[PDB]
Design a protein around this ligand. Sequence first.
Ligand SMILES: [Br-]
Ligand SMILES: [Br-]
Ligand SMILES: [Br-]
Ligand SMILES: [Br-]
Ligand SMILES: [Br-]
Ligand SMILES: [Br-]
Ligand SMILES: [Br-]
Ligand SMILES: [Br-]
Ligand SMILES: [Br-]
Ligand SMILES: [Br-]
Ligand SMILES: [Br-]
Ligand SMILES: [Br-]
Ligand SMILES: [Br-]
Ligand SMILES: [Br-]
Ligand SMILES: [K+]
Ligand SMILES: [K+]
Ligand SMILES: [K+]
Lengths: 179, 178, 169
Amino acid sequence: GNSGFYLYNTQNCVFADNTVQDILDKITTDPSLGLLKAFNNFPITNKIQCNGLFTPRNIETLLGGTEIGKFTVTPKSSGSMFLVSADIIASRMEGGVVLALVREGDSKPYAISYGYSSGVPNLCSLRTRIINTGLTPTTYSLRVGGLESGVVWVNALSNGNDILGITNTSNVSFLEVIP
Amino acid sequence: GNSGFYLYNTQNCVFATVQDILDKITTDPSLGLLKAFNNFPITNKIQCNGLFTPRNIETLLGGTEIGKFTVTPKSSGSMFLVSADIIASRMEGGVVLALVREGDSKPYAISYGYSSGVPNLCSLRTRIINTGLTPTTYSLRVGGLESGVVWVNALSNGNDILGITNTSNVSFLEVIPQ
Amino acid sequence: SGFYLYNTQNCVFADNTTDPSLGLLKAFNNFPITNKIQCNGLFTPRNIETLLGGTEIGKFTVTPKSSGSMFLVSADIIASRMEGGVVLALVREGDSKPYAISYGYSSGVPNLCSLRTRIINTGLTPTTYSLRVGGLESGVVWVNALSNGNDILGITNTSNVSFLEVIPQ
Ligand SMILES: [Br-]
Ligand SMILES: [Br-]
Ligand SMILES: [Br-]
Ligand SMILES: [Br-]
Ligand SMILES: [Br-]
Ligand SMILES: [Br-]
Ligand SMILES: [Br-]
Ligand SMILES: [Br-]
Ligand SMILES: [Br-]
Ligand SMILES: [Br-]
Ligand SMILES: [Br-]
Ligand SMILES: [Br-]
Ligand SMILES: [Br-]
Ligand SMILES: [Br-]
Ligand SMILES: [K+]
Ligand SMILES: [K+]
Ligand SMILES: [K+]
């Protein structure tokens, strides 16, 4: 109940009362998923004279036959295998052909197979499976020679000449599979 | 029309998801991402006295059994791609191979090979149509074409080839048709 | 401080499963060949790099499901001929010579003659291939039959050509 104007020090004042990509990277790089599988095919087109023999004395060493190819492969999944197919065009005077797949570091062949030529070229095959031991590149080589005796030519007639006058192709394929 | 001060009642106032897919993908048989593989090595030497003839080719009695294999598909509506790669010798002549599915009364698939006397690879390549996800058994029989004795994994006299044990293989790879 | 007029008014104042690019998705096709075919066409140095060598025994159409894929091809043909060489050639439609050539053998009795290769796919479109078989230089070759054209073991036999899609490294 009071109102008006008044001085406060020096002021005159009024006053008053008022996710797809994320899978994709996993899938293409996670080795533990059994998805995803390496494949490699290795053509062999050169004519190779295989003078090295296979015999009981060298069959369990590295010295049997003649090397015709060397292959490096890498698994993309853990605990996998490679299903291996070697299909080699070979000729020899009537007799047996031996094939040996060797894994680098071992002291003898990983797998041995047998083929035949009558004198004219014939496919000689090795089919096997490799047990992979990690995700590291691994190198394998294929050797080919006569069974006990004879010279074997790969990709050529028994004298070394071109079959049918052309270059021919033998193949070694590796297909990764999960057991 | 006014300014000043006034009383109002008593007041004086102024105014103026990844794991969820991954479990599916790694276990669902209907998607077709899961593919079985099995390889069966055969390393024993087996004398195959049983023959294949027109009278026994469509029975279970042709040739001699060299292996029996049990496999399980992981996907529905799948097939197995089969490769049997058998080392065999015989005196000059033909070799017959027959894959039999358990329960059937004759071979599923038949193939042919050759030996001149020295060992040679004899193969059978086929595809099997799978009918569920249950283990299934198959067997491989080998014998002469019409006549002759066939040795598997051995020379024509039963001895070791090159003095070692040799390996024949039968592989089954699961694949999905289109 | 006080009150004053500002204009008219009186105022207070104061100071305060379908993506091809992955690639899961792998086609498989198998083509059984069960007819007996008398392959009178020969392979010679003069026809080996043409379309005319041998005799066609099958034609296959396949479709890749993934990009930058290959088909792993296996042709496993039952064949007989009087003592000698068998030649197989896989041809891709539109080419003017074989994509791959392989060799087999018969002594007179049937034997498996194989061709194993890989094909490089170039898209996701159906593509047609064919297989041709014939003698090496001379001789008649019978597919799925004895060297005289009769049934082997008195039954129908089956040769196969398979295509399996795979993805290279
Ligand atoms: Br490749
Ligand atoms: Br020796
Ligand atoms: Br052969
Ligand atoms: Br296995
Ligand atoms: Br009979
Ligand atoms: Br059985
Ligand atoms: Br049946
Ligand atoms: Br022995
Ligand atoms: Br199919
Ligand atoms: Br047909
Ligand atoms: Br064509
Ligand atoms: Br061309
Ligand atoms: Br017969
Ligand atoms: Br694959
Ligand atoms: K021989
Ligand atoms: K090596
Ligand atoms: K012969």
